[PDB]
């Protein structure tokens, strides 16, 4: 799950999409398998 | 800690090819004016 997500901000006439694999190596495994297991993916201090 | 960059470096798998025999590698920067010496920023172990 690397660069998986992505924040993308629009301005207001352009935009400027970030990435987790630009931003976190600390990856949220999918195992805990075992149901309703929710994850996290924090974003430090996007200086937009 | 000041003016700087941080680069996480995804790498390939163990190849007797390409890497040589040795599973080792060690990972170097410069500024570089071309042949003016390089800094060993890390050294570790491959993993195949």
Same mark, same amino acid.
């Given at each position: 799950?690397?660069?998986?997500?992505?924040?993308?901000?629009?301005?207001?006439?352009?935009?400027?999409?970030?990435?987790?694999?630009?931003?976190?190596?600390?990856?949220?495994?999918?195992?805990?398998?075992?149901?309703?297991?929710?994850?996290?993916?924090?974003?430090?201090?996007?200086?937009? | 800690?000041?003016?700087?960059?941080?680069?996480?470096? +995804?790498?390939?798998?163990? @190849?007797?090819?390409?890497? %040589?025999?040795?599973?080792?590698?060690? +990972?170097?920067?410069?500024? @570089?004016?071309?042949?003016? %010496?390089?800094?060993?920023?890390?050294?570790?172990?491959?993993?195949?």
């Amino acid at each position: 799950s690397s660069d998986d997500i992505s924040m993308e901000i629009e301005l207001n006439s352009t935009k400027f999409e970030t990435i987790t694999g630009s931003d976190v190596g600390l990856r949220p495994p999918l195992y805990p398998t075992v149901s309703r297991e929710t994850l996290a993916f924090p974003f430090g201090k996007l200086s937009i | 800690p000041g003016q700087g960059t941080y680069v996480t470096l +995804i790498l390939k798998p163990y @190849d007797k090819n390409t890497h %040589g025999t040795n599973r080792a590698f060690t +990972i170097y920067y410069s500024n @570089d004016a071309t042949g003016s %010496g390089k800094f060993p920023v890390y050294s570790g172990s491959l993993s195949v």
